[PDB]
């Protein structure tokens, strides 16, 4: 009963943690949607070849007062904007760009001190199932990289500070949770055995089959 | 007693009992968007394509043949892949192995879907030359491939080049060959892919792996190898219509 | 109390970021997984000889059998705990069982003698009950739950061990488990081969599951570093 | 299915961004309702001649602490007033005017830190449809300007600070979102092709028909 | 989680700023648009000759045909991707298709020979399948899906090309698309005119859509600067 894929692949897993400020060089966050960065969830997803699911994104945004020497401070409430760029959509080159205003990118404004913001993304493949494993080239020409189908593109995620609250410096961290929903899986395949190296490929270092013992009669 | 199975021009000899292993309980049937996406089926393509035999010796790790790539150069299948663009096909492997009663060994014949291989160097991906072998099987390796600034596919036999435990490859449609009982293996593979039709030169649908778990052993005087022989038949293959609605 | 809080394990309805978008209909792809138990019911080769450099090779799986020096000597032996045990923690069964904290059921074991068609012998596969220790000799093994396996007639022998359950919490590695049984093989008779036939032959083992298997309290996998 | 006008002209588009303060010369915002300022929405609206719709206005008000040297600050919560002046209604000449109190202008008071304020305006034309394009003069006399019908008047929008929170200076920015509802469109017409220049007229600079290529057989 | 947040793409009920106000009833105005697909089904003149200063004039649309020096020479040619292609990105079809990220369907092409009532010739309109490259000669074009168009009998020839789909994400500009077909015209016979009749004549093309056309994932238009 706990072994159904709905009960095996529907756990809120943290897949990204970063920090952006109201002043300074770092002013926004970005993260191409891809589920292969967290190994604990990648290893569970890699039990099947093709998986079709929906995503529930939960963001935990917390702001800390950066140490500074600016006198006479009195902060206001901070408002954040999380803009989710759908596949084939314009992406911001800077914080105060004109791409944050585009209407086809469903951004969500959230005011500090409430329930965490949350939005649900539907199946975004132009095909019939996401492919955990691909045995081909991205392009017909030699230029195409091996094992990278352009059909598992889930989009990108940009976050920023709508306004600078106080006159002092403030750093805000954003944690992203991944929760797959309505999961269907096809063609089960063996577990990893080896350790993971990169997020883009299945490259690995050859390892033993299992752990050793004193003797065969032990 | 034996049997004969005539598909088109080709004829092949098989045992009365063949214990066929249908892939996922599904027979490779046809496809069940009108004028917008016309499709045309090809029949003569179906027939028995016999690949070159491979000699199985005591020091032999294993082999691997990509099912779409292997026939990319033989008859109509090799031709159709060059003419038409999109195509969906199913297969029927016929791995047969002949050795006397004084030979001993064991082989695993497994059809792996989307067998994405690894690379010696973690930074880059394997070259298509070291990945695709046409009109010839590709062999595994006993010791790990030395890593460096190269695009050599990882080919260790135990990791299988996909970075898993070779004892767990059974999850996929498979069949064992004990040189004291079974002498052949038949595996019918349906069309497994996310899309109804795919480009056949840019994507391998299925991969055929034959790995000997138990080493071949014989007494001095017997033939010092065992000629494994593979026969592939494309099944229910259809291609895009080149007409004008 | 209990509102305006974010709990990771909650099932609520979420506002769709992109509505008015027609998702592609589903198609028929072969081999749809419904439950993880089906995966745990496929026989997987068991590395019985995980001794030294045997693991980093292909000979870890094969079990060596020699006619000479085996009047009644033991061939092999291992405890009967799938998960948490060097011989079974890496199979399909063990890998599924290393995700749950509580599991009980029955285990199926299949041995396949891989030798010439002209070799004949006998073996004595014995099953020790949980509390009882592994047998010291061939007689002790016979006075229990044994199966005399003749390789001339049958080329494959199957077992169905019951009373298999979780023995410890978290993850432990230990030889000779107290609440688990032991499977051992003894040379009843030696391998009898004619002339011009190898007398050194190998065996292989395949571990599966059964209809009466339960798995509860899913946790993290300990094989990730 | 995604090509229905309800799914093509119902996207929340940002159409105005300004800032007002609790002290200084700038003390309030004003913006005559008109949908021709944002080119991304104007170009979509200009696919049809007459369009009849309803408006859902969403305001995102964020206040930042302006740099200053005023000592001993301790701000209170800020309250804003957004007054929507209906067509043919009195308009304020200053912040502390007596027009902010009139009862026929539906103003909405919103206290900083809650869900953003939102109000819905119905079809305000005395005619049967707004005219994207007009081929006449505003007045019978020569004084009337060309292509400016006085029947597309959607009113004006004024915002201000109900009270000065602290003793220090504070600047508050207001973003306005336009969401048409119940959209009916008649007489489709060709896309713009040329770039936009002003917001009041269809004046343009002559441009080529398309982009060039090497040859006719290329 | 998921409450007290402003999401741009949400459908909720809003409090009316001005209630108790009777909106004017609707009237019958001719030509009510229900779907954008109907607009994409009106034939639009296609600027085939967008070569150099031809775009900044009226001769971009007209295709020049000369009787002399055309025993088997090609008249014109272009890939078959509506949106993202110089020849079709600015038509009505292309302008509707530049709003969606995913579109598939069939395209209708109409050619109208605009010459004297006394001119006769033949043309060889060929359709190259997606993967296949554009034909090198008149023979290669004939050995395919051609249509021999005689301008003496018929003054207008119509085609219906299928397998038309999105070839790239975002926006790309490229001649000779890999996953798209090519339409080319060859001079089977030369233009035969009597005395006191111009032999230089022009053609025109009209691109439309079909009932089997889909458009999903609406995005921003790239023609706005």
JSON list of N, CA and C in Angstrom, two decimals, chain B residues 35-92:
[
{"chain": "B", "resi": 35, "resn": "UNK", "atom": "N", "xyz": [-5.47, 13.73, -42.36]},
{"chain": "B", "resi": 35, "resn": "UNK", "atom": "CA", "xyz": [-4.72, 14.39, -43.46]},
{"chain": "B", "resi": 35, "resn": "UNK", "atom": "C", "xyz": [-3.52, 15.16, -42.91]},
{"chain": "B", "resi": 36, "resn": "UNK", "atom": "N", "xyz": [-3.63, 15.71, -41.70]},
{"chain": "B", "resi": 36, "resn": "UNK", "atom": "CA", "xyz": [-2.53, 16.54, -41.15]},
{"chain": "B", "resi": 36, "resn": "UNK", "atom": "C", "xyz": [-1.25, 15.71, -41.01]},
{"chain": "B", "resi": 37, "resn": "UNK", "atom": "N", "xyz": [-1.37, 14.46, -40.55]},
{"chain": "B", "resi": 37, "resn": "UNK", "atom": "CA", "xyz": [-0.18, 13.58, -40.39]},
{"chain": "B", "resi": 37, "resn": "UNK", "atom": "C", "xyz": [-0.45, 12.24, -41.09]},
{"chain": "B", "resi": 38, "resn": "UNK", "atom": "N", "xyz": [-0.30, 12.14, -42.43]},
{"chain": "B", "resi": 38, "resn": "UNK", "atom": "CA", "xyz": [-0.50, 10.88, -43.14]},
{"chain": "B", "resi": 38, "resn": "UNK", "atom": "C", "xyz": [0.60, 9.86, -42.80]},
{"chain": "B", "resi": 39, "resn": "UNK", "atom": "N", "xyz": [0.24, 8.58, -42.69]},
{"chain": "B", "resi": 39, "resn": "UNK", "atom": "CA", "xyz": [1.24, 7.52, -42.42]},
{"chain": "B", "resi": 39, "resn": "UNK", "atom": "C", "xyz": [1.07, 6.39, -43.44]},
{"chain": "B", "resi": 40, "resn": "UNK", "atom": "N", "xyz": [2.19, 5.81, -43.90]},
{"chain": "B", "resi": 40, "resn": "UNK", "atom": "CA", "xyz": [2.13, 4.68, -44.87]},
{"chain": "B", "resi": 40, "resn": "UNK", "atom": "C", "xyz": [2.90, 3.45, -44.31]},
{"chain": "B", "resi": 41, "resn": "UNK", "atom": "N", "xyz": [2.31, 2.23, -44.20]},
{"chain": "B", "resi": 41, "resn": "UNK", "atom": "CA", "xyz": [3.06, 1.06, -43.73]},
{"chain": "B", "resi": 41, "resn": "UNK", "atom": "C", "xyz": [3.92, 0.37, -44.80]},
{"chain": "B", "resi": 42, "resn": "UNK", "atom": "N", "xyz": [5.01, -0.30, -44.39]},
{"chain": "B", "resi": 42, "resn": "UNK", "atom": "CA", "xyz": [5.87, -1.04, -45.35]},
{"chain": "B", "resi": 42, "resn": "UNK", "atom": "C", "xyz": [5.89, -2.51, -44.91]},
{"chain": "B", "resi": 43, "resn": "UNK", "atom": "N", "xyz": [5.71, -3.46, -45.83]},
{"chain": "B", "resi": 43, "resn": "UNK", "atom": "CA", "xyz": [5.59, -4.90, -45.41]},
{"chain": "B", "resi": 43, "resn": "UNK", "atom": "C", "xyz": [6.84, -5.70, -45.78]},
{"chain": "B", "resi": 44, "resn": "UNK", "atom": "N", "xyz": [7.24, -5.70, -47.05]},
{"chain": "B", "resi": 44, "resn": "UNK", "atom": "CA", "xyz": [8.43, -6.46, -47.52]},
{"chain": "B", "resi": 44, "resn": "UNK", "atom": "C", "xyz": [9.62, -6.26, -46.57]},
{"chain": "B", "resi": 45, "resn": "UNK", "atom": "N", "xyz": [9.71, -5.09, -45.93]},
{"chain": "B", "resi": 45, "resn": "UNK", "atom": "CA", "xyz": [10.80, -4.82, -44.95]},
{"chain": "B", "resi": 45, "resn": "UNK", "atom": "C", "xyz": [10.89, -6.00, -43.97]},
{"chain": "B", "resi": 46, "resn": "UNK", "atom": "N", "xyz": [9.75, -6.54, -43.54]},
{"chain": "B", "resi": 46, "resn": "UNK", "atom": "CA", "xyz": [9.74, -7.67, -42.58]},
{"chain": "B", "resi": 46, "resn": "UNK", "atom": "C", "xyz": [10.38, -8.88, -43.24]},
{"chain": "B", "resi": 47, "resn": "UNK", "atom": "N", "xyz": [11.37, -9.49, -42.59]},
{"chain": "B", "resi": 47, "resn": "UNK", "atom": "CA", "xyz": [12.08, -10.68, -43.11]},
{"chain": "B", "resi": 47, "resn": "UNK", "atom": "C", "xyz": [13.19, -10.98, -42.10]},
{"chain": "B", "resi": 48, "resn": "UNK", "atom": "N", "xyz": [13.91, -12.08, -42.27]},
{"chain": "B", "resi": 48, "resn": "UNK", "atom": "CA", "xyz": [14.93, -12.47, -41.27]},
{"chain": "B", "resi": 48, "resn": "UNK", "atom": "C", "xyz": [16.29, -11.94, -41.71]},
{"chain": "B", "resi": 49, "resn": "UNK", "atom": "N", "xyz": [16.82, -10.97, -40.97]},
{"chain": "B", "resi": 49, "resn": "UNK", "atom": "CA", "xyz": [18.16, -10.42, -41.29]},
{"chain": "B", "resi": 49, "resn": "UNK", "atom": "C", "xyz": [19.15, -11.13, -40.38]},
{"chain": "B", "resi": 50, "resn": "UNK", "atom": "N", "xyz": [20.05, -11.93, -40.97]},
{"chain": "B", "resi": 50, "resn": "UNK", "atom": "CA", "xyz": [21.03, -12.68, -40.15]},
{"chain": "B", "resi": 50, "resn": "UNK", "atom": "C", "xyz": [22.31, -11.85, -40.06]},
{"chain": "B", "resi": 51, "resn": "UNK", "atom": "N", "xyz": [22.70, -11.50, -38.83]},
{"chain": "B", "resi": 51, "resn": "UNK", "atom": "CA", "xyz": [23.93, -10.71, -38.62]},
{"chain": "B", "resi": 51, "resn": "UNK", "atom": "C", "xyz": [25.14, -11.64, -38.58]},
{"chain": "B", "resi": 52, "resn": "UNK", "atom": "N", "xyz": [26.35, -11.08, -38.65]},
{"chain": "B", "resi": 52, "resn": "UNK", "atom": "CA", "xyz": [27.61, -11.87, -38.62]},
{"chain": "B", "resi": 52, "resn": "UNK", "atom": "C", "xyz": [27.67, -12.63, -37.29]},
{"chain": "B", "resi": 53, "resn": "UNK", "atom": "N", "xyz": [28.17, -13.87, -37.32]},
{"chain": "B", "resi": 53, "resn": "UNK", "atom": "CA", "xyz": [28.35, -14.65, -36.07]},
{"chain": "B", "resi": 53, "resn": "UNK", "atom": "C", "xyz": [29.54, -14.11, -35.27]},
{"chain": "B", "resi": 54, "resn": "UNK", "atom": "N", "xyz": [29.54, -14.34, -33.96]},
{"chain": "B", "resi": 54, "resn": "UNK", "atom": "CA", "xyz": [30.61, -13.91, -33.07]},
{"chain": "B", "resi": 54, "resn": "UNK", "atom": "C", "xyz": [31.13, -15.15, -32.36]},
{"chain": "B", "resi": 55, "resn": "UNK", "atom": "N", "xyz": [32.44, -15.25, -32.23]},
{"chain": "B", "resi": 55, "resn": "UNK", "atom": "CA", "xyz": [33.03, -16.41, -31.57]},
{"chain": "B", "resi": 55, "resn": "UNK", "atom": "C", "xyz": [33.12, -16.19, -30.07]},
{"chain": "B", "resi": 56, "resn": "UNK", "atom": "N", "xyz": [32.46, -17.06, -29.32]},
{"chain": "B", "resi": 56, "resn": "UNK", "atom": "CA", "xyz": [32.46, -16.99, -27.86]},
{"chain": "B", "resi": 56, "resn": "UNK", "atom": "C", "xyz": [33.60, -17.86, -27.33]},
{"chain": "B", "resi": 57, "resn": "UNK", "atom": "N", "xyz": [34.59, -17.22, -26.71]},
{"chain": "B", "resi": 57, "resn": "UNK", "atom": "CA", "xyz": [35.78, -17.96, -26.21]},
{"chain": "B", "resi": 57, "resn": "UNK", "atom": "C", "xyz": [35.83, -17.85, -24.68]},
{"chain": "B", "resi": 58, "resn": "UNK", "atom": "N", "xyz": [36.81, -18.47, -24.04]},
{"chain": "B", "resi": 58, "resn": "UNK", "atom": "CA", "xyz": [36.88, -18.48, -22.55]},
{"chain": "B", "resi": 58, "resn": "UNK", "atom": "C", "xyz": [37.04, -17.04, -22.04]},
{"chain": "B", "resi": 59, "resn": "UNK", "atom": "N", "xyz": [37.88, -16.24, -22.70]},
{"chain": "B", "resi": 59, "resn": "UNK", "atom": "CA", "xyz": [38.14, -14.85, -22.26]},
{"chain": "B", "resi": 59, "resn": "UNK", "atom": "C", "xyz": [37.29, -13.89, -23.11]},
{"chain": "B", "resi": 60, "resn": "UNK", "atom": "N", "xyz": [35.97, -13.89, -22.90]},
{"chain": "B", "resi": 60, "resn": "UNK", "atom": "CA", "xyz": [35.08, -13.07, -23.72]},
{"chain": "B", "resi": 60, "resn": "UNK", "atom": "C", "xyz": [34.10, -12.34, -22.82]},
{"chain": "B", "resi": 61, "resn": "UNK", "atom": "N", "xyz": [34.19, -11.02, -22.70]},
{"chain": "B", "resi": 61, "resn": "UNK", "atom": "CA", "xyz": [33.32, -10.29, -21.77]},
{"chain": "B", "resi": 61, "resn": "UNK", "atom": "C", "xyz": [31.86, -10.27, -22.18]},
{"chain": "B", "resi": 62, "resn": "UNK", "atom": "N", "xyz": [31.57, -9.88, -23.41]},
{"chain": "B", "resi": 62, "resn": "UNK", "atom": "CA", "xyz": [30.19, -9.70, -23.84]},
{"chain": "B", "resi": 62, "resn": "UNK", "atom": "C", "xyz": [30.14, -8.88, -25.10]},
{"chain": "B", "resi": 63, "resn": "UNK", "atom": "N", "xyz": [28.91, -8.64, -25.56]},
{"chain": "B", "resi": 63, "resn": "UNK", "atom": "CA", "xyz": [28.67, -7.93, -26.81]},
{"chain": "B", "resi": 63, "resn": "UNK", "atom": "C", "xyz": [27.45, -7.04, -26.65]},
{"chain": "B", "resi": 64, "resn": "UNK", "atom": "N", "xyz": [27.25, -6.14, -27.63]},
{"chain": "B", "resi": 64, "resn": "UNK", "atom": "CA", "xyz": [26.04, -5.27, -27.63]},
{"chain": "B", "resi": 64, "resn": "UNK", "atom": "C", "xyz": [25.74, -4.80, -29.06]},
{"chain": "B", "resi": 65, "resn": "UNK", "atom": "N", "xyz": [24.49, -4.95, -29.51]},
{"chain": "B", "resi": 65, "resn": "UNK", "atom": "CA", "xyz": [24.07, -4.52, -30.86]},
{"chain": "B", "resi": 65, "resn": "UNK", "atom": "C", "xyz": [22.86, -3.59, -30.74]},
{"chain": "B", "resi": 66, "resn": "UNK", "atom": "N", "xyz": [22.97, -2.37, -31.27]},
{"chain": "B", "resi": 66, "resn": "UNK", "atom": "CA", "xyz": [21.85, -1.39, -31.23]},
{"chain": "B", "resi": 66, "resn": "UNK", "atom": "C", "xyz": [20.86, -1.83, -32.30]},
{"chain": "B", "resi": 67, "resn": "UNK", "atom": "N", "xyz": [19.61, -2.11, -31.94]},
{"chain": "B", "resi": 67, "resn": "UNK", "atom": "CA", "xyz": [18.67, -2.73, -32.92]},
{"chain": "B", "resi": 67, "resn": "UNK", "atom": "C", "xyz": [18.39, -1.86, -34.15]},
{"chain": "B", "resi": 68, "resn": "UNK", "atom": "N", "xyz": [18.10, -0.54, -34.08]},
{"chain": "B", "resi": 68, "resn": "UNK", "atom": "CA", "xyz": [17.93, 0.25, -35.31]},
{"chain": "B", "resi": 68, "resn": "UNK", "atom": "C", "xyz": [19.23, 0.40, -36.11]},
{"chain": "B", "resi": 69, "resn": "UNK", "atom": "N", "xyz": [20.35, 0.67, -35.43]},
{"chain": "B", "resi": 69, "resn": "UNK", "atom": "CA", "xyz": [21.67, 0.89, -36.10]},
{"chain": "B", "resi": 69, "resn": "UNK", "atom": "C", "xyz": [22.18, -0.37, -36.79]},
{"chain": "B", "resi": 70, "resn": "UNK", "atom": "N", "xyz": [21.98, -1.55, -36.19]},
{"chain": "B", "resi": 70, "resn": "UNK", "atom": "CA", "xyz": [22.56, -2.79, -36.75]},
{"chain": "B", "resi": 70, "resn": "UNK", "atom": "C", "xyz": [22.06, -3.03, -38.17]},
{"chain": "B", "resi": 71, "resn": "UNK", "atom": "N", "xyz": [20.78, -2.75, -38.44]},
{"chain": "B", "resi": 71, "resn": "UNK", "atom": "CA", "xyz": [20.20, -3.02, -39.77]},
{"chain": "B", "resi": 71, "resn": "UNK", "atom": "C", "xyz": [20.31, -1.78, -40.66]},
{"chain": "B", "resi": 72, "resn": "UNK", "atom": "N", "xyz": [20.93, -0.70, -40.16]},
{"chain": "B", "resi": 72, "resn": "UNK", "atom": "CA", "xyz": [21.11, 0.54, -40.97]},
{"chain": "B", "resi": 72, "resn": "UNK", "atom": "C", "xyz": [22.23, 0.33, -41.99]},
{"chain": "B", "resi": 73, "resn": "UNK", "atom": "N", "xyz": [21.97, -0.40, -43.07]},
{"chain": "B", "resi": 73, "resn": "UNK", "atom": "CA", "xyz": [22.95, -0.73, -44.15]},
{"chain": "B", "resi": 73, "resn": "UNK", "atom": "C", "xyz": [22.52, -2.04, -44.82]},
{"chain": "B", "resi": 74, "resn": "UNK", "atom": "N", "xyz": [21.51, -2.71, -44.27]},
{"chain": "B", "resi": 74, "resn": "UNK", "atom": "CA", "xyz": [21.08, -4.01, -44.85]},
{"chain": "B", "resi": 74, "resn": "UNK", "atom": "C", "xyz": [19.67, -3.94, -45.45]},
{"chain": "B", "resi": 75, "resn": "UNK", "atom": "N", "xyz": [19.56, -4.25, -46.74]},
{"chain": "B", "resi": 75, "resn": "UNK", "atom": "CA", "xyz": [18.30, -4.36, -47.50]},
{"chain": "B", "resi": 75, "resn": "UNK", "atom": "C", "xyz": [17.43, -3.11, -47.48]},
{"chain": "B", "resi": 76, "resn": "UNK", "atom": "N", "xyz": [16.11, -3.33, -47.45]},
{"chain": "B", "resi": 76, "resn": "UNK", "atom": "CA", "xyz": [15.07, -2.27, -47.44]},
{"chain": "B", "resi": 76, "resn": "UNK", "atom": "C", "xyz": [15.13, -1.45, -46.15]},
{"chain": "B", "resi": 77, "resn": "UNK", "atom": "N", "xyz": [15.33, -2.11, -45.01]},
{"chain": "B", "resi": 77, "resn": "UNK", "atom": "CA", "xyz": [15.37, -1.39, -43.71]},
{"chain": "B", "resi": 77, "resn": "UNK", "atom": "C", "xyz": [16.47, -0.31, -43.77]},
{"chain": "B", "resi": 78, "resn": "UNK", "atom": "N", "xyz": [17.66, -0.66, -44.27]},
{"chain": "B", "resi": 78, "resn": "UNK", "atom": "CA", "xyz": [18.75, 0.32, -44.39]},
{"chain": "B", "resi": 78, "resn": "UNK", "atom": "C", "xyz": [18.35, 1.44, -45.33]},
{"chain": "B", "resi": 79, "resn": "UNK", "atom": "N", "xyz": [17.67, 1.09, -46.43]},
{"chain": "B", "resi": 79, "resn": "UNK", "atom": "CA", "xyz": [17.22, 2.06, -47.46]},
{"chain": "B", "resi": 79, "resn": "UNK", "atom": "C", "xyz": [16.10, 2.95, -46.91]},
{"chain": "B", "resi": 80, "resn": "UNK", "atom": "N", "xyz": [15.02, 2.34, -46.41]},
{"chain": "B", "resi": 80, "resn": "UNK", "atom": "CA", "xyz": [13.85, 3.10, -45.89]},
{"chain": "B", "resi": 80, "resn": "UNK", "atom": "C", "xyz": [14.32, 4.15, -44.89]},
{"chain": "B", "resi": 81, "resn": "UNK", "atom": "N", "xyz": [15.23, 3.80, -43.99]},
{"chain": "B", "resi": 81, "resn": "UNK", "atom": "CA", "xyz": [15.74, 4.76, -42.98]},
{"chain": "B", "resi": 81, "resn": "UNK", "atom": "C", "xyz": [16.33, 6.00, -43.67]},
{"chain": "B", "resi": 82, "resn": "UNK", "atom": "N", "xyz": [16.97, 5.82, -44.83]},
{"chain": "B", "resi": 82, "resn": "UNK", "atom": "CA", "xyz": [17.52, 6.98, -45.58]},
{"chain": "B", "resi": 82, "resn": "UNK", "atom": "C", "xyz": [16.40, 7.76, -46.29]},
{"chain": "B", "resi": 83, "resn": "UNK", "atom": "N", "xyz": [15.40, 7.08, -46.84]},
{"chain": "B", "resi": 83, "resn": "UNK", "atom": "CA", "xyz": [14.34, 7.78, -47.62]},
{"chain": "B", "resi": 83, "resn": "UNK", "atom": "C", "xyz": [13.34, 8.45, -46.67]},
{"chain": "B", "resi": 84, "resn": "UNK", "atom": "N", "xyz": [12.47, 7.67, -46.03]},
{"chain": "B", "resi": 84, "resn": "UNK", "atom": "CA", "xyz": [11.46, 8.21, -45.08]},
{"chain": "B", "resi": 84, "resn": "UNK", "atom": "C", "xyz": [12.17, 8.83, -43.88]},
{"chain": "B", "resi": 85, "resn": "UNK", "atom": "N", "xyz": [11.48, 9.71, -43.15]},
{"chain": "B", "resi": 85, "resn": "UNK", "atom": "CA", "xyz": [12.07, 10.36, -41.95]},
{"chain": "B", "resi": 85, "resn": "UNK", "atom": "C", "xyz": [11.55, 9.70, -40.67]},
{"chain": "B", "resi": 86, "resn": "UNK", "atom": "N", "xyz": [10.25, 9.81, -40.38]},
{"chain": "B", "resi": 86, "resn": "UNK", "atom": "CA", "xyz": [9.74, 9.26, -39.14]},
{"chain": "B", "resi": 86, "resn": "UNK", "atom": "C", "xyz": [9.35, 7.81, -39.35]},
{"chain": "B", "resi": 87, "resn": "UNK", "atom": "N", "xyz": [9.65, 6.96, -38.36]},
{"chain": "B", "resi": 87, "resn": "UNK", "atom": "CA", "xyz": [9.30, 5.53, -38.45]},
{"chain": "B", "resi": 87, "resn": "UNK", "atom": "C", "xyz": [9.21, 4.85, -37.10]},
{"chain": "B", "resi": 88, "resn": "UNK", "atom": "N", "xyz": [8.23, 3.95, -36.92]},
{"chain": "B", "resi": 88, "resn": "UNK", "atom": "CA", "xyz": [8.10, 3.18, -35.65]},
{"chain": "B", "resi": 88, "resn": "UNK", "atom": "C", "xyz": [8.15, 1.68, -35.98]},
{"chain": "B", "resi": 89, "resn": "UNK", "atom": "N", "xyz": [8.92, 0.90, -35.22]},
{"chain": "B", "resi": 89, "resn": "UNK", "atom": "CA", "xyz": [9.10, -0.54, -35.56]},
{"chain": "B", "resi": 89, "resn": "UNK", "atom": "C", "xyz": [9.17, -1.42, -34.31]},
{"chain": "B", "resi": 90, "resn": "UNK", "atom": "N", "xyz": [8.91, -2.72, -34.45]},
{"chain": "B", "resi": 90, "resn": "UNK", "atom": "CA", "xyz": [9.02, -3.68, -33.33]},
{"chain": "B", "resi": 90, "resn": "UNK", "atom": "C", "xyz": [10.00, -4.77, -33.75]},
{"chain": "B", "resi": 91, "resn": "UNK", "atom": "N", "xyz": [10.56, -5.54, -32.82]},
{"chain": "B", "resi": 91, "resn": "UNK", "atom": "CA", "xyz": [11.61, -6.51, -33.23]},
{"chain": "B", "resi": 91, "resn": "UNK", "atom": "C", "xyz": [11.32, -7.94, -32.76]},
{"chain": "B", "resi": 92, "resn": "UNK", "atom": "N", "xyz": [12.12, -8.91, -33.22]},
{"chain": "B", "resi": 92, "resn": "UNK", "atom": "CA", "xyz": [11.99, -10.34, -32.83]},
{"chain": "B", "resi": 92, "resn": "UNK", "atom": "C", "xyz": [13.38, -10.98, -32.83]}
]
